[PDB]
């Protein structure tokens, strides 16, 4: 008989949560690139 | 199909999908700001 757990449901949810996490990481990288460029422009 | 939905689960899934969309929009803007500045650095 089928198991109590729906593994496919678990994976679908985990995939969506990981998509949010990876976009947040990419957002942070972009923000840091902008910070870095502005810091470089401000010298002198 | 038949219209049976768990309201709280559906709302959480939609909120996560909207977060993905918002992060994608935000990251497009940051990337395009960086591209714009590089293009300006090419003004000869």
From Swiss-Prot, chains A, B:
Q: In which tissues is it expressed?
A: Ubiquitously expressed. Not found in heart and skin.
**Location(s) in or outside the cell:** Cytoplasm; Cytoplasm, Cytoskeleton, Cilium basal body; Cytoplasm, Cytoskeleton, Cilium axoneme; Cytoplasm, Cytoskeleton, Microtubule organizing center, Centrosome
Tell me where on the tree of life, at the top rank, the source sits.
Eukaryota
Free-text function comment from the UniProt entry: Negatively regulates signaling through the G-protein coupled thromboxane A2 receptor (TBXA2R). May be involved in mechanisms like programmed cell death, craniofacial development, patterning of the limbs, and formation of the left-right axis. Involved in the organization of apical junctions; the function is proposed to implicate a NPHP1-4-8 module. Does not seem to be strictly required for ciliogenesis. Involved in establishment of planar cell polarity such as in cochlear sensory epithelium and is proposed to implicate stabilization of disheveled proteins.
> How does the record describe its quaternary structure?
Interacts with NPHP4 and NPHP1; NPHP1, NPHP4 and RPGRIP1L are proposed to form a functional NPHP1-4-8 module localized to cell-cell contacts and the ciliary transition zone; NPHP4 mediates the interaction between NPHP1 and RPGRIP1L. Interacts with IQCB1; the interaction likely requires additional interactors. Interacts with TBXA2R (via C-terminus), RPGR, NEK4. Interacts with NPHP4, INVS and DVL2; proposed to form a complex involved in DVL2 stabilization. Interacts with PSMD2.
Q: Which family does it belong to?
A: Belongs to the RPGRIP1 family.
Q: Protein name, please?
A: Protein fantom
Protein's organism: Mus musculus
Gene this chain is encoded by: Rpgrip1l
